[PDB]
Design a binder for this molecule. Structure first.
Ligand code: CL
Ligand code: CL
Ligand code: CL
Ligand code: CL
Ligand code: CL
Ligand code: CL
Ligand code: CL
Ligand code: CL
Ligand code: CL
Ligand code: CL
Ligand code: CL
Ligand code: CL
Ligand code: CL
Ligand code: CL
Ligand code: CL
Ligand code: CL
Ligand code: CL
Ligand code: NA
Ligand code: NA
Ligand code: NA
Ligand code: NA
Ligand code: NA
Lengths: 494, 494, 494
């Protein structure tokens, strides 16, 4: 069910006494604002001049507002200069607004949509942002709180002089709810969300949908030779799982798009144990898998004409009497031998088996999503994602463009001859999973992209931007659902 | 069996040729010292003048001493100035004396008690110290040594011109033996003393006494909802236990005094693993529980008119395939959810379940004893205990007074609005068990005292003074039995 | 000059169109609120019911407000429940209000003072908080910014039906300005504020006042035997200074109150060098000296009938060819020899010389203020101060009471026989400045309080609360002026 209830010009009743208007830097840049049958432009101009309301981007102003005999509660959100209003600004505008609406427990209000739409922007971008933020900005994970407040519906009565389509908002809502679905999996405690229960939850979620889900249990995945996934997950009581998700949106026998996700439900580091502060927030080590589920959820609900195969490598990296150790040599699904020198480099191992398995489906492109390396955070900062291409320079360039347009910072790092050679620097095995040298993020990418062969492969290291430690217009602390907006937008263009 | 055998004015035997006298700074401040019927004051004055004997507090002097025809072995212990003789001085005097007696393998000796008693001190304080130190100062844990010497009895023939009651010494002995009982549990190797065997030993010890013992096994803990105790102890082969100890010293119906003890038989830190030097001496992480047992042992043997309920939360904090991890969320006995961010903060977790359980008995006051925080040691040093009050400002003030009178350094640290708020700083659960900020000892206290509600609660962080790395007049290295003297004295006043 | 311009019952001006009212949880608890000649209580009740304004403590609400013809800008600050309104609440109320007024660049406004005063609280407390926060909450240090905005005066036209005395506000302003004076010294860059320039600034500040200032230059220090102050400061190009500040508020010759301040303008740690993050914000290592200056500034401007002598030990702890080293032995002003084992324990060294010098004036009490120990922060947290008494148990108890009443968290830590003995644990000198054992804050206090002899001495370790890393109702990040409110209040009661 939805956080907001969107209604278009159905009725105008005495029950409702709350009004929402967007305020730009220059009011004359909009078509004269009118509520009921009265022009209210000059009264808003006086309130702006008195500094009772303002235009600062995303700032909330409230005031008592008289129109005719009735006194209304006016809610103002600043739009800034309409000429220089970015997509980020739109997210900030809708974000702060819906957050205010929810925290003030407002159940019934008018929304003057014409004050948000300018001559400068296309209708779809404003309504898309409106739809997404109505779910994404108002997200909360209070399921384990004893003092959780009862969920309520906010009725938004949209008033527009020339608007009929409401589909662009409903499109945004389904994307926003897909992001929140990913967030829910990520926020889940590791003692509750194990590889098994994670698989079971995915099955139950897609049970009555067009999306097919296959779960490969522990004794199947070992006998089928998933050696690396076995190695990583064997140290836990809760054994690893492989989840295959298929969505046939165009139904043609056409080569699917492979989306691979790292589903490490908890990472202790294994025998290469993490520090005290290092283990904090390690339930978020499966964000990659969660975000893949979100992308497929969005694609299916939007009924996009695309074929997608999703592969999730789920495991729990734990210490016990028989868990993986440095010096251990395992046989990958590819048949290649891998020497493990660092058990905290577990992500690239499970991705390797998953990528090789994904390539069996003969996809047009493979995209993997993982919270892999600390070095990627050191490289680009906590708020940007690292992207690596292997035989897919063109598809990456499109994604780097799309991401910059949807307020998601993604930047390229290289895979050179150095990294292609150094993954083979083992005295015993075909491959090694760790280097003591620098450029560790590049090494990890080289390791993962090796298993795709010549198939176009993009690796996304989202160790940084997958989570945030600061609340914003995009929602509270925790999982961000990073990449979902970018990939969905890219999928829309296929 | 007792270390010393106290006999009052027993026949002056020719088999005995050893003599003990206390020597003050001024011999004229005492009643003329006489042995047999002979006045020996002047001869002791000459030996003091020749520096053959002296008065320095707790210093042992020995000499050949002629009285009549027979040559005696004279043993002298300094008393210092009798005007300025503290209770600590008395412990130092009796402590060093009985230690010398035991190391010299003396089996039969006279003790001139009149030389130890002055007009300035209370007779009861001297004889109390005498009784305690006869057991406490002479303590040794040589049960795992192959070269352990055979235990022997020292016959102390007390000579006093005007003394009849010997009950104040026997009172001290039973207190001293209670301290040693606590020490025995603490010194026990962790591979021998597990939560199960610890519970079993308590049952067997109180089997034929007025003290009732109930043991709650692992299956009972889980089905009754001891979630936090379960969480801490599940990682060990030796599963947790809850031990309930009841002593009804006065009445069936009068509100008991709750004594809660942390019984972590071994603390590795869990996945938040300790350093090499950090794990050393971690068998002492159950000193709190051991000292509660000691307090109840003393109260019952002294037949004090008080009702006591003792609750011990026993577990072993270990690493395995399914042990607790940072990010884990558990349901406490209170019904509240707790996010675990640091598995080395295990003490406050087991105390939380124990305190809530203790409060079901509707006690007049709850007192918990635990080796909790390193920050408490940083705060007050290794030799002082940290005390925290919650709705019991008055009872604490009495205890702070009593402790300073029985040579036990205990000082107050605060629980403010800051700490009461910060235990709730979790993005997912009702409570969090760890802060990255400072004032960690205050946080831990706030966490523990939360579970008592409005019931008067005093928390004792004895991480420092529960053990000593230096031998002294109070005994050898290891467990000190800290707080036992203070609480017993407080219980005597109810 | 002043940040706010307070005018009481000033002429009704036709140009002022801004109005400030305090809003409680129940409006009927106040005397019926009236502006101009109109009762506005029931119109405010409707706005509160519509959630246009509210009562949440310290929350700002604004709205268009019609009274008669003219439309006013109404500014509302919540007061909460008037029955349970603490002094902290008052600071939060005035703090957030004046911060809003300044950030909104408001130059002329009405203030309905009667809405802030209740039958439940003392009048003097409301106006005191109003005065302090008008300066303290609005503080900014933008002197080194190129884009610093021009300072402006806000005219506050107070409207009260029964109020004449304005002196309680002017009293608060002078206290607030004294806090800001201390903040200015603390915020000053260490390459600008050296011991010399710090001394020069103090001279120039008190030049035309009742306060006398004496500066002891480097040559005078060594020749007069300030050995410890010399030792600490000799490694810098900018040599140490001793600043003596005398204020005779009552009597030509009556025992003064000694206020000693640590004036380390910069602390690198010396040869016991700090880490990278350790040196950050070390210009605040002279907050103690700055706050003493603030206290004396407040006392003199309030013309309090007290005698005060202020002693400031100013130095810069630097590394060079001849700076102090571990193993160095120096002769203190007392004539005692001190072995330096840790050059980062520089504070206790300069305080020692300053305290001994202060005692020459034969004060009734000595109070020192210093950012000394990291262990004090570990003990009580970053937001509380550690207080230690030596022969002044009574005066401390009064200060601990006063502080809790003026929203300043100060708590006692002990100085025991252990600490009194351990400061003498040197193989070579009379004293040692550092222990490798725990309880380091207690050790430091013992070291400092040693030099006062038997004179009543209170030591304040303000390492934590002297600075804040978070903006609040008390002002921006940086120096807090901690202790100034507490000591001034204490001085008012002499
Ligand atoms: Cl505009
Ligand atoms: Cl193999
Ligand atoms: Cl990895
Ligand atoms: Cl296949
Ligand atoms: Cl291959
Ligand atoms: Cl002595
Ligand atoms: Cl004497
Ligand atoms: Cl749960
Ligand atoms: Cl703990
Ligand atoms: Cl019960
Ligand atoms: Cl409770
Ligand atoms: Cl009220
Ligand atoms: Cl409130
Ligand atoms: Cl010298
Ligand atoms: Cl220091
Ligand atoms: Cl002088
Ligand atoms: Cl001295
Ligand atoms: Na490849
Ligand atoms: Na992050
Ligand atoms: Na409590
Ligand atoms: Na003193
Ligand atoms: Na600080």
């Amino acid at each position: 069910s939805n956080a907001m209830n969107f209604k278009l010009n159905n009725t105008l009743s005495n029950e409702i006494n709350t009004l929402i208007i967007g305020i730009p830097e220059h009011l004359n840049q909009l078509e004269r604002i009118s509520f009921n049958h009265i022009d209210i432009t000059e009264s808003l101009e006086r309130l702006k001049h008195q500094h009772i309301i303002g235009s600062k981007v995303g700032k909330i102003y409230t005031t008592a507002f008289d129109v005719q005999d009735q006194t209304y509660r006016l809610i103002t959100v600043g739009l800034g200069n309409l000429k220089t209003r970015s997509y980020q600004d739109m997210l900030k505008i809708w974000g702060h607004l819906f957050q205010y609406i929810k925290s003030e427990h407002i159940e019934d209000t008018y929304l003057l949509m014409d004050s948000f739409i300018s001559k400068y922007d296309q209708l779809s971008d404003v309504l898309m942002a409106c739809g997404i933020q109505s779910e994404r900005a108002t997200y909360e994970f209070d399921h384990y709180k004893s003092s959780k407040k009862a969920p309520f519906k906010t009725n938004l009565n949209l008033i527009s002089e020339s608007l009929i389509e409401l589909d662009f908002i409903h499109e945004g809502i389904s994307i926003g709810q897909s992001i929140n679905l990913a967030r829910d999996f990520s926020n889940m405690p590791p003692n509750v969300l194990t590889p098994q229960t994670f698989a079971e939850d995915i099955v139950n979620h897609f049970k009555n949908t067009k999306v097919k889900v296959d779960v490969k249990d522990y004794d199947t995945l070992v006998s089928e030779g998933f050696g690396l996934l076995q190695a990583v997950g064997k140290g836990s009581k809760h054994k690893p799982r492989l989840v295959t998700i298929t969505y046939n949106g165009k139904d043609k026998d056409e080569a699917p798009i492979a989306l691979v996700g790292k589903g490490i439900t908890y990472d202790s580091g294994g025998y290469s144990i993490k520090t005290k502060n290092g283990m904090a927030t390690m339930k978020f080590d499966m964000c990659g898998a969660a975000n893949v589920v979100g992308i497929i959820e969005a694609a299916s609900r939007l009924q996009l004409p695309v074929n997608i195969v999703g592969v999730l490598a789920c495991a729990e990296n734990m210490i016990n009497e028989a868990s993986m150790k440095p010096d251990d040599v395992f046989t990958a699904l590819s048949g290649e031998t891998v020497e493990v020198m660092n058990t905290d480099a577990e992500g690239r191992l499970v991705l390797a088996d998953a990528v090789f398995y994904a390539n069996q489906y003969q996809p047009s492109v493979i995209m993997d999503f993982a919270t892999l390396t600390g070095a990627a955070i050191v490289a680009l900062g906590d708020d940007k994602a690292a992207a690596f291409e292997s035989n897919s320079k063109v598809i990456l360039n499109d994604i780097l463009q799309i991401s910059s347009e949807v307020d998601e910072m993604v930047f390229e790092l290289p895979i050179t001859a150095t990294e292609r050679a150094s993954i083979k620097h083992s005295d015993i095995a075909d491959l090694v999973n760790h280097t003591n040298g620098q450029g560790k993020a590049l090494f990890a990418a080289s390791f993962v992209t090796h298993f795709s062969g010549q198939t176009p492969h993009i690796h996304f290291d989202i160790a940084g931007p997958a989570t945030t430690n600061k609340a914003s217009y995009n929602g509270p602390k925790g999982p961000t659902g990073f990449m979902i907006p970018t990939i969905v937008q890219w999928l829309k263009q296929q």
